[PDB]
Amino acid sequence: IEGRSRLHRRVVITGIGLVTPLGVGTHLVWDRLIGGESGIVSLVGEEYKSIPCSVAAYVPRGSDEGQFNEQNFVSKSDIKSMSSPTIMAIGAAELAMKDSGWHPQSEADQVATGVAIGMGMIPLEVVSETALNFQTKGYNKVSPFFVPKILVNMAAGQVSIRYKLKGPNHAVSTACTTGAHAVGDSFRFIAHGDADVMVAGGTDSCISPLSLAGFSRARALSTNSDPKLACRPFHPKRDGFVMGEGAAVLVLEEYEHAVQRRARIYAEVLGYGLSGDAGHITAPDPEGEGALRCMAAALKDAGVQPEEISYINAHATSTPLGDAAENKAIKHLFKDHAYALAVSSTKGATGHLLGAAGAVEAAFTTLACYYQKLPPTLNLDCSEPEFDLNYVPLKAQEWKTEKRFIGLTNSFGFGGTNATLCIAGL
Amino acid sequence: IEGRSRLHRRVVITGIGLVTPLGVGTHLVWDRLIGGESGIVSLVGEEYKSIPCSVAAYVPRGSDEGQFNEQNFVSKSDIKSMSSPTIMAIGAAELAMKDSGWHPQSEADQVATGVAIGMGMIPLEVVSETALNFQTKGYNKVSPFFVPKILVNMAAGQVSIRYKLKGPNHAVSTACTTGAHAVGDSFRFIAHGDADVMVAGGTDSCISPLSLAGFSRARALSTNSDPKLACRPFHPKRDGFVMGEGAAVLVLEEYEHAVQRRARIYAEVLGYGLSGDAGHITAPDPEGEGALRCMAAALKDAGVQPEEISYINAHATSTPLGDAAENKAIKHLFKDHAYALAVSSTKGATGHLLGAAGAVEAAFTTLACYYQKLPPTLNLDCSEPEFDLNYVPLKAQEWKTEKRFIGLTNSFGFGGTNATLCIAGL
Ligand SMILES: [N+]
Ligand SMILES: [N+]
């Protein structure tokens, strides 16, 4: 005959694990973010000679609290067999599950818990080094681990294997929209009943001369040699994004499941919206039409009116055209209400985490909901007349409301692929 | 706290586009498959001399009907900006949309049509060739299109741009499960209301010395030098898969939407199940637990009892362990009903299309429903005691009886990622 009705369950976020250029550990990173810190640094080394971009954002490595020590998460042997983004994902997943208090042991809990971690790009250096090894030293020098090491889905696979997660096992690779799709897809799977818990997020760790060359050739990266100033979303002098690396993982969980085990609940995922610009492979719709459609779709999924939104964590990566288009979309969707909400882009602090960007920013939007405090857009000391909203410039803002705090987070990628998540306080 | 009831719509398949080693074009490819043909051939090229593998399945190229002519779909200029899998996906999507009669022109129809095309692995030679170019000829000799060519989501992106498809734009990358996830995710998006039409599928075209070396070092590939016999799913002498290339795209469409425009409908997508083995990085569970769980999840999603299944298109790639494990899962789940259904693997005809495998096999299962005719498992002239089911050996079987024709198609991937689709006649 026709469609029936089915139960659509409620989904909450009960844990967050962050491995980022601001540091390692969700709450330390939040403190640093709110305090106006940044992990953008100058490139070092002759190997970056000739490339127009001279800055990036690295995960700080070492044994100190807040630094990333791979050995805390994977063994020396495991290091050789997995890629850098996979290792970061395992770290972030470990931290997220510890943050959530969810460590499935029984077969039932194992099968009820899935993984949806995406990666935006293959580890290019693993491919090129192996090719050289193969071409010079022959077949027998190729590692039996080569293929599993290089596959985009192996962050999700290894997290599943290492933590015994037997539910849905999914991995998206949608360029800079990856981390948002991972969270949204996990939300849908839980709402649908495929799993009661999902370990969701994104990872990327591919800063190298070759990758920076590629993105510079696509004219995507900032050419500013000053790492303090390079990334400045909405700023008149913005000149391209700054490549970062890291992983962000969130534990999503069915609402009753969370309540019954007395989990700490940060926020509820209310809606997920998706669209395509269908315009250009790298340039965004200049009017921001795709961004408007995915934000609108997220609001429709959530059953929320534009007027009910308090905060938008913008994608705004510090590009001339990108930031302007998103700003346009926000103003066109929210009309007079655009002046009554707050928008900020946190990429000034983290850099652009590529496949992890949408997940890290879903984490920051979740924490903004939980704390009703908004992280700043760094470096925004002035703006053009077209940028006339509250972008939380420079300094964090309190945002207290007695009504429900509801936020959106946007992610857009090459290929014109767009997603928005609608996340709310409880 | 437990959630709210929402409309869950019905979803049908109204077009199929195939670019495969059996040829190009829907009913042509089906005819060849049903006729017992195969596209597996000897590897040609001196670059393959050192590697143990000697067979593969290529898309036949040329201007004859049934051959792939890239110039029919993409300009000579656009070719340079796109990878081989992207080009095959464009061809497959155009053919699928032609087959469906869906060419959206209105703003409403364009926004209602999304794209979900995945890719398992980008061609490795694009990376290593660019690396060499960068090293020896410098930054300013790197193609500005390098990053687009190495992104998994570019097939979905290009299909969106080229056919102005403005709905959800999503690209999964779950190794050999990719094509199944793309169709299932599309099904869920349409059922949920995100889109009324999705152009869904998978593409891969990465046969190269390094890729084959990788799979050989992983002990995944048949070393049989006879292309007529190399791939033989369920056979006593099976010894690894044969790598293929290609793309398969299906137009999924909301049921009322299809009826209203008087679409020709092939089949209904009833359910989608996902699981993870959480075991070995490349091998499936020897007892097929994960496979059992994803099949069972698909039946649950579809609202269908095991006894209602009449046909399974097996993932069975022609590996000792994998084929036995899937067979075990089928027997464990269906119990005595396992002897009442039919199971076949079509990889003897196409080879293993990697990220496209689950989509091509979804297409074949869809056509099995439509025609009530089952494609054979090639080369199965005998079997071991444990393989005691009806595998449609050698010759196609008519399947016109019982009640509703309901099929399953299974796909399994490295990282233990599993998916099943349940697809039925109407
Ligand atoms: N964002
Ligand atoms: N299959």
Per-residue 3-state assignment (H helix, E strand, C coil) for B336-380:
HHHHCCEEECCHHHHCECHHHHHHHHHHHHHHHHHHCEECCECCC
d(CA A247, CA A74): 15
Among the partner residues A52, A144, A293, nearest to B166 by beta-carbon distance? A293
Amino acid at A384: E
What is the Cβ-side half-sphere exposure of residue B409, based on CA atoms within 13 angstroms? 31
Nearest to B121 by CA among B409, B412, B420, B414: B414
Question: A163 and A220: one domain?
Answer: yes
How far is B154 from chain A, CA to nearest CA, in Å?
Answer: 6
Amino acid at A276: G
Asked if residue B118 lies in contact with residue B181, where contact means CB atoms within 8 angstroms, the answer is yes
Q: Give which of B151, B162, B223 to mutate to test A binding, by max A Cβ within 10 Å.
A: B151
CA of B238 to the centre of ligand 1 (A): 49
**Sequence-ordered list of residues with C-beta below 8 angstroms from that of A105, at least 6 positions apart, any chain:** A164
Question: A340 and A221: one domain?
Answer: no
Integer angstrom CA distances of residue A22 from A38, A57, A112, A205: 6, 9, 33, 15
What is the Cβ-side half-sphere exposure of residue A184, based on CA atoms within 13 angstroms? 36
Nearest to B225 by CA among B55, B368, B370: B55
Q: What do you get for the CA distance between the two ends of chain B, in Å? A: 37
Say which residue the tokens 């400045």 belong to.
A232
How far is B201 from chain A, CA to nearest CA, in Å?
Answer: 14
Task: Provide the strand spans (E) within B67-193.
Answer: 113-119, 169-170
Asked if residue B349 lies in contact with residue B39, where contact means CB atoms within 8 angstroms, the answer is yes
Which structure tokens are listed for A217? 């050739």
Question: B200 and B71: one domain?
Answer: yes
Q: How many domains does chain A have?
A: 2
Cβ–ligand 1 contact at A346 (below 6 Å): no
Asked if residue B166 lies in contact with residue B195, where contact means CB atoms within 8 angstroms, the answer is no
| Catalytic site positions of B | 176, 315, 352
Q: Angle between the B124-137 and A209-217 helix axes, to the nearest 10 degrees?
A: 90
Nearest to B284 by CA among B415, B391, B177: B415
Whether A122 sits inside 8 A of B50 (CB atoms) is no
What is the Cβ-side half-sphere exposure of residue A262, based on CA atoms within 13 angstroms? 0
Nearest to A302 by CA among A199, A421, A213: A421
How far is B263 from chain A, CA to nearest CA, in Å?
Answer: 16
Whether A4 sits inside 8 A of B8 (CB atoms) is yes
Nearest to A91 by CA among A178, A16, A198: A16
Amino acid at B252: L
d(CA B410, CA B131): 37
Nearest to A115 by CA among B188, B300, B275: B275
Ligand with the closest atom to the CA of B375: 2
Cβ–ligand 1 contact at A409 (below 6 Å): yes
Q: Give the Cα-Cα-Cα angle A104, A107, A109 (nearest 5 degrees).
A: 40
Chain B residues within an 8 Å CB radius of A173: 118-119, 151-153, 171-173
Asked if residue A5 lies in contact with residue B6, where contact means CB atoms within 8 angstroms, the answer is yes
CB contact residues (below 8 A), chain A span 102-131, against chain B: 110-111, 114-115, 118-122, 124, 127-128, 130-131
Asked if residue B12 lies in contact with residue B187, where contact means CB atoms within 8 angstroms, the answer is no
Cβ–ligand 2 contact at B410 (below 6 Å): yes
CA of A105 to the centre of ligand 2 (A): 31
CA of B22 to the centre of ligand 2 (A): 16
Which structure tokens are listed for A74? 């994977």
Question: Helix %, strand %, coil % for chain A, to 5?
Answer: 40, 20, 40
Chain A residues within an 8 Å CB radius of B285: none
**Sequence-ordered list of residues with C-beta below 8 angstroms from that of A416, at least 6 positions apart, any chain:** A276, A277, A278, A279, A280, A281, A284, A285, A290, B157, B160, B161, B169
How far is B413 from chain A, CA to nearest CA, in Å?
Answer: 9
Which structure tokens are listed for A361? 């920013």
d(CA A115, CA A104): 13
DSSP H helices in B372-426:
none
Cβ–ligand 1 contact at A315 (below 6 Å): yes
Q: Reduce the DSSP state of residue A340 to 3 states and report it.
A: coil
Q: Does B413 touch chain A (CB under 8 A)?
A: yes
Question: B103 and B133: one domain?
Answer: yes
- Resolution of the PDB structure in angstroms: 1.6
Residue A355 carries which DSSP code?
G
Asked if residue A82 lies in contact with residue A134, where contact means CB atoms within 8 angstroms, the answer is no
Amino acid at B291: A
Cβ–ligand 2 contact at B411 (below 6 Å): yes
Q: In chain A, which residue's Cα lies nearest the Cα of B160?
A: A278
Asked if residue A172 lies in contact with residue A185, where contact means CB atoms within 8 angstroms, the answer is yes
Last residue of a domain, which of B222, B251, B270? Answer: B270
Which residues in B367-389 are b (16+ Cβ under 10 Å) and which e? bbbbbbbbbbbbbbeebeeebeb
Question: B203 and B321: one domain?
Answer: no
Rg from Cα positions in chain A: 20
Q: Does A134 touch chain B (CB under 8 A)?
A: yes
Question: B172 and B224: one domain?
Answer: yes
List, as one string, the DSSP characters of A181-202.
HHHHHHHHHHHHTS-SEEEEEE
Asked if residue B189 lies in contact with residue B168, where contact means CB atoms within 8 angstroms, the answer is yes
Integer angstrom CA distances of residue B52 from A278, B47, B365: 43, 12, 33
Chain B residues within an 8 Å CB radius of A212: none
**Sequence-ordered list of residues with C-beta below 8 angstroms from that of B291, at least 6 positions apart, any chain:** B275, B284, B285, B325, B326, B329, B330, B410, B412, B418
Integer angstrom CA distances of residue B150 from A137, A211, A411, B125, B288: 26, 10, 20, 10, 34
Question: B262 and B291: one domain?
Answer: no
Whether A157 sits inside 8 A of B192 (CB atoms) is no
Whether A160 sits inside 8 A of B51 (CB atoms) is no
How many Cβ atoms sit within 10 Å of the Cβ of residue B271? 21
Which structure tokens are listed for B327? 């067979």
DSSP H helices in A276-356:
289-302, 320-334, 347-350
d(CA A419, CA A407): 14
Say which residue the tokens 């799993």 belong to.
A195
How many Cβ atoms sit within 10 Å of the Cβ of residue A312? 27
Question: B8 and B23: one domain?
Answer: yes
Last residue of a domain, which of B270, B303, B320? Answer: B270
Which structure tokens are listed for B268? 């209904």
CA of B351 to the centre of ligand 2 (A): 12
Whether B4 sits inside 8 A of A2 (CB atoms) is no
Asked if residue B284 lies in contact with residue B329, where contact means CB atoms within 8 angstroms, the answer is no
Whether A153 sits inside 8 A of B147 (CB atoms) is no
CB contact residues (below 8 A), chain B span 313-372, against chain A: none
Q: Reduce the DSSP state of residue B206 to 3 states and report it.
A: coil
Range of the domain at A346: 271-426
Q: Reduce the DSSP state of residue A19 to 3 states and report it.
A: strand
Integer angstrom CA distances of residue A148 from A144, B121, B175, B346: 8, 11, 9, 25
How many Cβ atoms sit within 10 Å of the Cβ of residue B91? 26
Question: A215 and A283: one domain?
Answer: no
Asked if residue B280 lies in contact with residue B219, where contact means CB atoms within 8 angstroms, the answer is no
Which structure tokens are listed for B103? 């060419």
Residue B48 carries which DSSP code?
G
Question: B400 and B296: one domain?
Answer: yes
Ligand with the closest atom to the CA of B412: 2
**Sequence-ordered list of residues with C-beta below 8 angstroms from that of B37, at least 6 positions apart, any chain:** B22, B349
d(CA B373, CA B386): 25
Chain B residues within an 8 Å CB radius of A189: 274
Element containing residue B258 per DSSP (H, E):
helix B255-260
Whether B274 sits inside 8 A of A194 (CB atoms) is yes
Which structure tokens are listed for A323? 């930031």
Q: Give the Cα-Cα-Cα angle B217, B218, B221 (nearest 5 degrees).
A: 90
d(CA B266, CA A288): 37
Q: What is the CATH number of the domain that holds B390?
A: 3.40.47.10
d(CA B300, CA B291): 14
Q: Does A253 touch chain B (CB under 8 A)?
A: no
d(CA A280, CA A277): 8
Nearest to A161 by CA among B112, B216, B147, B413: B413
Last residue of a domain, which of B247, B270, B293? Answer: B270
Nearest to A23 by CA among A116, A88, A90: A88
CA dihedral (A124, A125, A129, A131) in degrees, to 10, reads: 10
d(CA B26, CA B63): 17
Nearest to A216 by CA among B133, B132, B141: B141
DSSP H helices in A22-153:
26-34, 76-81, 84-100, 107-111, 124-137, 146-150
Q: In chain A, which residue's Cα lies nearest the Cα of B108?
A: A293
CA of B356 to the centre of ligand 2 (A): 11
Phi, psi of A4 (to 5 degrees): -95, -165
Whether B171 sits inside 8 A of A5 (CB atoms) is no
Which structure tokens are listed for A161? 């294997």
Amino acid at B303: G
Whether A213 sits inside 8 A of B153 (CB atoms) is no
Q: In chain A, which residue's Cα lies nearest the Cα of B193?
A: A301
Whether B150 sits inside 8 A of A175 (CB atoms) is no
Question: Helix %, strand %, coil % for chain B, to 5?
Answer: 40, 25, 40
Q: How many CB pairs under 8 A join A and B?
A: 328
Cβ–ligand 1 contact at A158 (below 6 Å): no
d(CA B68, CA B168): 28
Q: Give the Cα-Cα-Cα angle A331, A396, A398 (nearest 5 degrees).
A: 85
**Sequence-ordered list of residues with C-beta below 8 angstroms from that of B396, at least 6 positions apart, any chain:** B34, B35, B36, B373, B374, B375, B376
CA of B358 to the centre of ligand 2 (A): 6
DSSP H helices in B152-223:
154-163, 178-192, 209-217
Asked if residue A421 lies in contact with residue A248, where contact means CB atoms within 8 angstroms, the answer is no
d(CA A256, CA A259): 5
Long-range contacts of B336-340 (CB under 8 A, 24+ apart): B337/B306, B337/B307, B337/B309, B338/B389, B339/B388, B339/B389, B339/B390, B340/B307, B340/B310
Q: Does A259 touch chain B (CB under 8 A)?
A: yes
Question: A289 and A207: one domain?
Answer: no
Chain B residues within an 8 Å CB radius of A219: 144
Say which residue the tokens 């009820």 belong to.
A112
Q: In chain B, which residue's Cα lies nearest the Cα of A420?
A: B168
Say which residue the tokens 């360029």 belong to.
A175
CA of A362 to the centre of ligand 1 (A): 7
Question: B234 and B306: one domain?
Answer: no
Chain A residues within an 8 Å CB radius of B163: 278
CA dihedral (B145, B147, B152, B155) in degrees, to 10, reads: -20
